[PDB]
């Protein structure tokens, strides 16, 4: 236990007074060698805690802000009284960190670290002397204007920020995030320029540093690559491809290094300067270090008019060539007929009721407008769209046929989504009837995209070498890759008229291919959303006035914007590659589009020279410019930039910009949930090359998970509360290892968190008894089936109860009751007694039968991701990277091929697991509640194919429990021939459920032993026949511990 | 293009080795035929359009009549069948004969 | 093969602009093999027929 040692040492630092006492609370598994639950703390003298210890670190000179480096007047670091004159006009939304942790908490987490490492040995001393020279700059600037005391909900009022500079809080937050990631001398020279210059230059610093990364991935030679097959399976190929670069790229890379010297950066353009002499892959992680560090400057929060002015003001002309727009509109028309040819001819059940298909899946839509609703006696304000339907279905206003206009009378409100170092993107806020019309038709466009080679939904898995590995499979010395960066994709001229009229023309060739009266109707309503968006006005508020701007283009926030933007690229890059073939003769190997970032691999006849690269790039940005789409045409021979991934020289490099101590939107979480987002943003940045200290993170989990009931008492939970596998998990003991503990007091506490895993909310039980909720449930049972049954109607009325957990105040009355019920268990050490099978109860019976021995494995495979940590790179080089991805979606089964066809619901794999192990007449009672007819659910039960479907659901459910497809286990090959020489388990037939879990648990204990220690072990399990039958009856009653904030911990982006 | 009458070129001397480095020089021949083995490995083309592994083991597990969920432990027939090792064997059979 | 009335129409015109522009030629039209050639893409001959 190491977190318990830092927890006791922290409270002896922040409470320096004599009146502070700490009472540890212990507990045991027996009645009468004990692990501790929490640590009490009574401290009374608490005024001026941080402002007294800051003065001993405030030396040197403070930073004087430069006031003539930004174009706008409210982006400079001026005094707030000089910027906002009165307290009535004070906008917090330009500097708000939007995290529930104040600046006075972040300064104690550094001053606690600087005391523990004040007198270390000569290797760890140089890290301390580099993190002290940076903290002198941060402390002496804050101490001049003082420390701003936060609000009760962690905002900053006007009266505490009156005499300070405006961005003092949101600069001291990001600079503490940067100085706690300095490890080498190269990391100290980057952090000094991004701390000094970031005090004045709040506009164009993250753009100048992160600019030359699209160029530098085209200079590094390839010597050995990973490729992928036609089906997505990995291969290793060791060709040699030379990098060819024209003389105008180096005349552009020299321009990017002289823009970085006008801004004042004088030691970041010396590392790129000294790397270009070699152009080597062995020094390239220095060039991705500078690209990853540039995103930690901070967010560019601006006014909504001032950030949507260059986007909404474009020059549309009629001096384009109209001969090129006829082929562009025809190629969009040919795709929509090609996508909906099979679900319209054979009339699918999903298109026949598009009104019901959007109603039962409106929890996937974006948040709409803020509207006043009335649910019985209560009056609530909500932006979720399925709450707008329950108010509109009661008052006699629910008309899904009539689609409202978005012209000058009723404009479209606008929301933003921004990323540091890029421009901002606007998001439409559409009514709730643009989601119902565009859901059953777009879902038929995204099943064709999962079987077509040129789209992005084909190469969409959990791994990252199998998805973006088709870039380098066509690479040779006679080919070139052509990745182009369209600047303003949203409002270009090729998107307003010919894109909406290419879809409308494609839905008129599908109104003559069918014979039902319903499929003509759902293809007419999807056509009606395109004529109304042909002339759309947008609404942007500024000051007193509200501006209405005409905007006939395509923005995000729609439903079709992920599958119809991919059609407009494959029709536009097919027209440009046909105009460039009048000067050259090639053969297009692959085209692959993902939104608005794409590539295309052209294979030439003769060898590629330096003249065929400079003159193809001048025929891409001159053919695009004939269609009024200005682009930055880039061609390369070795490496590209596919979407946020940088494949340079055979290796794949990611970006590591995730802001830990800042956020872009004010989230609706608690502190306990944002202490697991802060940890899971540290594991992501550690795997990509931005290593923050662990002891700064573990200090930040101490200051966020603690909760007080009185102003003098504090409760700090221990390691065994936060690390155990339950609802309340925050972090793990070792970093990349998910451990399931097996001790008689560790299963005793995991069952003790099973009582208060389900709490009730006082808001959702008053909505569910109101009259307008019963009117919404009653009119869904009419459309779902023509009959009336009492079983299906309670099965519907208790399904929209869980849909109200997406509402933000309802999902906060549960979580505020989780932590307030935990405090009665951390104070009273005795708990309750119950029995319920978890995953740890199964592993209690398997672990005493494994015998370990020492073993060795020589390295045989090489590394394709060179920014991974050292203990994970020993696993990959010894057992191999993943070759093929095993699916856990369950759609290969025969019950998930029946639910998806005959109904619109989607049941969770934790729901299909519980019902597949019951009798025949219990699967019947469940399948009718899904919407399946009685004659179909009598077929599947009466066919006895559920007996052979028991093992296709348990295979995909155990892979979800142990998190094999997600986490950091999605890199190692599990069917490798080098893990089977270590696992030696004799085979005993006729029980497949137990033999499967003996080989999946033995494969994890060998991997989790070689990350902790770096040495391999071999296992042997002579499991008896009398213990296999006892474990066989517990493989079906296993229950999982699901949490809402943990479902985001499975994916990276 | 067709070159003029004044175009000249220098011809290399490709005559076979007179030292006979394969005769009793066994530590100099082993490092001169490893050089021709790595160079011949970066030339032989790699296999694209292989049959997928999951659509092949599931076809192979119907002929052997294996049990459910334990296709890798019941028989040791289906071990080390990847696409990484299909391309590796085709390269190391062509490049071992050329060098 | 189906473009016949519109492919005879090329060579009646392609060999008439060549025939009526050759009358405005004063130097001898000698024919030897030059060094550098002018590239015809056969993809652009498909776009003419």
């Amino acid at each position: 236990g190491k977190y318990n040692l830092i927890l006791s040492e922290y409270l002896s630092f922040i409470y320096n007074s004599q009146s502070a006492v700490q009472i540890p609370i212990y507990y045991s598994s027996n009645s009468e060698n004990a692990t501790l639950l929490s640590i009490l703390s009574y401290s009374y003298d608490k005024y001026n805690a941080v402002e007294r210890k800051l003065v001993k670190y405030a030396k040197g000179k403070p930073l004087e802000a430069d006031l003539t480096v930004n174009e706008l007047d409210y982006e400079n670091n001026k005094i707030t009284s000089e910027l906002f004159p009165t307290a009535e006009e004070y906008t917090d939304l330009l500097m708000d960190p939007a995290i529930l942790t104040s600046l006075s908490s972040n300064l104690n987490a550094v001053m606690f670290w600087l005391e523990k490492h004040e007198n270390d040995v000569a290797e760890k001393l140089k890290i301390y002397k580099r993190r002290l020279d940076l903290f002198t700059i941060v402390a002496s600037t804050v101490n001049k204007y003082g420390v701003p005391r936060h609000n009760a909900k962690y905002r900053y009022e006007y009266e505490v920020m009156k005499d300070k500079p405006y961005y003092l809080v949101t600069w001291a937050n990001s600079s503490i995030e940067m100085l706690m990631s300095v490890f080498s001398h190269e990391d100290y020279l980057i952090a000094r320029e991004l701390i000094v210059l970031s005090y004045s230059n709040r506009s164009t610093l993250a753009k100048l540093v992160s600019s030359p990364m699209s160029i530098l991935v085209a200079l590094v030679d390839i010597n050995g690559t990973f490729i992928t097959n036609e089906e997505l399976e990995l291969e290793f190929s060791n060709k040699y491809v030379r990098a060819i670069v024209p003389d105008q790229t180096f005349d552009e890379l020299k321009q990017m290094l002289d823009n970085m010297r006008k801004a004042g950066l004088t030691d970041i353009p010396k590392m790129i300067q000294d790397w270009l002499v070699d152009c080597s892959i062995e020094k390239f992680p220095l060039m991705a270090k500078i690209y990853s560090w540039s995103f930690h400057v901070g967010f560019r929060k601006q006014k909504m008019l001032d950030a949507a002015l260059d986007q909404l003001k474009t020059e549309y002309t009629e001096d384009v060539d109209d001969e090129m727009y006829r082929e562009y509109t025809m190629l969009i028309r040919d795709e929509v007929v090609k996508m909906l040819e099979e679900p319209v001819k054979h009339d699918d059940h999903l298109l026949q009721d598009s009104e019901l298909a959007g109603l039962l899946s409106m929890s996937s839509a974006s948040n709409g407008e803020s509207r006043q609703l009335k649910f019985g006696r209560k009056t609530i304000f909500s932006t979720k769209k399925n709450m707008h339907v329950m108010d509109d279905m009661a008052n006699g206003r629910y008309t899904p046929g009539i689609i409202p206009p978005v012209n000058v009378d009723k404009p479209i409100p606008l929301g933003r989504r921004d990323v540091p170092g890029r421009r901002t993107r606007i998001i439409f806020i559409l009514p709730y009837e643009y989601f119902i019309a565009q859901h059953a038709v777009v879902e038929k466009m995204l099943i064709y995209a999962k079987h077509t080679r040129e789209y992005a939904e084909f190469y969409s898995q959990s791994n990252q070498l199998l998805s973006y590995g088709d870039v380098t499979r066509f690479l040779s010395n006679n080919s070139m890759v052509l990745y182009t960066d369209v600047s303003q994709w949203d409002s270009s001229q090729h998107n307003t008229q010919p894109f909406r009229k290419g879809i409308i023309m494609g839905l008129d060739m599908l109104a003559n291919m069918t014979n039902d009266a319903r499929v003509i109707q759902t293809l007419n309503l999807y056509k009606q959303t395109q004529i109304n968006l042909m002339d759309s006005y947008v609404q942007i508020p500024d000051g007193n006035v509200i501006k209405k701007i005409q905007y006939g283009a395509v923005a995000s926030g729609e439903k079709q914007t992920k599958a119809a933007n991919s059609i407009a690229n494959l029709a536009l890059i097919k027209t440009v590659l046909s105009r460039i073939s009048n000067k050259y003769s090639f053969a297009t190997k692959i085209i692959r589009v993902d939104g608005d970032d794409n590539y295309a691999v052209l294979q030439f006849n003769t060898e590629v020279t330096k003249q065929m690269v400079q003159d193809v790039s001048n025929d891409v940005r001159e053919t695009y410019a004939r269609m009024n789409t200005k682009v930055k045409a880039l061609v390369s021979t070795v490496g590209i930039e596919i979407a946020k991934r940088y494949i340079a020289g055979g290796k794949i490099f990611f970006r590591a910009g995730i802001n830990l101590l800042n956020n872009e939107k004010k989230g609706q979480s608690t502190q306990w949930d944002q202490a697991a987002v802060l940890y899971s943003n540290y594991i992501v940045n550690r795997l990509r090359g931005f290593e923050t200290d662990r002891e700064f993170i573990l200090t930040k989990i101490m200051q966020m998970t603690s909760v007080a009931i009185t102003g003098s008492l504090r409760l700090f939970p221990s390691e065994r509360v936060l690390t155990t596998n339950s609802t309340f998990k925050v972090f793990d003991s070792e970093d990349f290892i998910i451990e399931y503990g097996t001790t008689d007091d560790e299963v005793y506490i995991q069952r003790a968190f099973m009582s208060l895993s389900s709490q009730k909310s006082g808001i959702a039980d008053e909505i569910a008894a109101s009259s307008t909720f019963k009117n919404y449930v009653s009119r869904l049972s009419e459309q779902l089936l023509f009959s009336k049954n009492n079983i299906v109607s309670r099965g519907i009325a208790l399904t929209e109860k869980a849909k109200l957990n997406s509402y933000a105040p309802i999902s906060l009355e549960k979580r505020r009751a989780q932590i307030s019920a935990l405090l009665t268990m951390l104070q009273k050490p005795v708990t309750f007694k119950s029995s319920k099978i978890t995953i740890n109860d199964i592993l209690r019976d398997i672990k005493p039968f494994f015998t370990v021995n020492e073993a060795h494995l020589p390295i045989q495979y090489q590394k394709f991701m060179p920014t991974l940590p050292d203990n994970v790179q020993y696993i990959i080089q010894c057992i191999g990277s993943r070759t093929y991805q095993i699916e856990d979606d369950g759609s290969k089964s025969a019950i998930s091929r029946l639910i998806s066809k005959y109904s619109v619901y989607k049941p969770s794999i934790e729901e299909l697991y519980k019902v597949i192990s019951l009798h025949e007449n219990e699967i019947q009672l469940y399948l009718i509640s899904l919407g399946i007819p009685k004659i179909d659910a009598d077929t599947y039960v009466g066919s006895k194919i559920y007996s052979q479907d028991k093992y296709r659901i348990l295979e995909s459910y155990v892979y979800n429990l142990l998190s094999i497809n997600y986490g950091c286990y999605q890199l190692f090959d599990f069917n490798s021939p080098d893990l089977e020489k270590l696992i030696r388990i004799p085979f005993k037939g006729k029980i497949p459920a137990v033999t499967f879990i003996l080989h999946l648990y033995a494969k994890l204990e060998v991997i989790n032993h070689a990350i902790k220690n770096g040495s391999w072990i071999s296992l042997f399990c002579n499991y008896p026949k009398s213990e296999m039958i006892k474990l066989w009856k517990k493989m079906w009653n296993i229950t999982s511990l699901r949490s809402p904030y943990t479902n985001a911990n499975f994916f990276q982006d | 293009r067709n070159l003029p009458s004044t175009a000249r070129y220098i011809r290399p001397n490709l005559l076979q080795d007179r030292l006979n480095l394969h005769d009793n020089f066994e530590s100099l021949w082993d490092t001169i035929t490893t050089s021709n083995y790595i160079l011949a490995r970066s030339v032989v083309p790699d296999l694209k359009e292989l049959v997928s592994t999951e659509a092949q083991i599931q076809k192979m597990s119907q002929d052997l009549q294996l049990e459910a969920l334990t296709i890798q432990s019941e028989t040791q027939f289906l071990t080390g069948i990847n696409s990484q090792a299909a391309n590796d064997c085709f390269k190391t059979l062509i490049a071992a004969m050329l060098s | 093969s189906n473009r016949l009335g519109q492919l005879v129409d090329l060579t009646r015109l392609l060999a008439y602009n060549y025939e009526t522009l050759m009358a405005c030629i004063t130097m001898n039209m000698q024919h030897v093999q030059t060094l550098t050639t002018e590239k015809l893409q056969l993809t652009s001959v498909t776009s003419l027929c």
């Binding site: 030679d221 270009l276 002499v277 | - | -």
Partner: peptide, 27 residues
């Protein structure tokens, strides 16, 4: 300065990027 302009005279001089000079020996 003379130090930054000398990079653009070295970066094109080196032989690991130079290719196909022989259509210009004929030209």
């Amino acid at each position: 300065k003379e130090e930054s302009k000398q990079l653009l005279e070295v970066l094109k001089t080196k032989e690991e990027h130079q290719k196909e000079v022989q259509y210009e020996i004929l030209q």
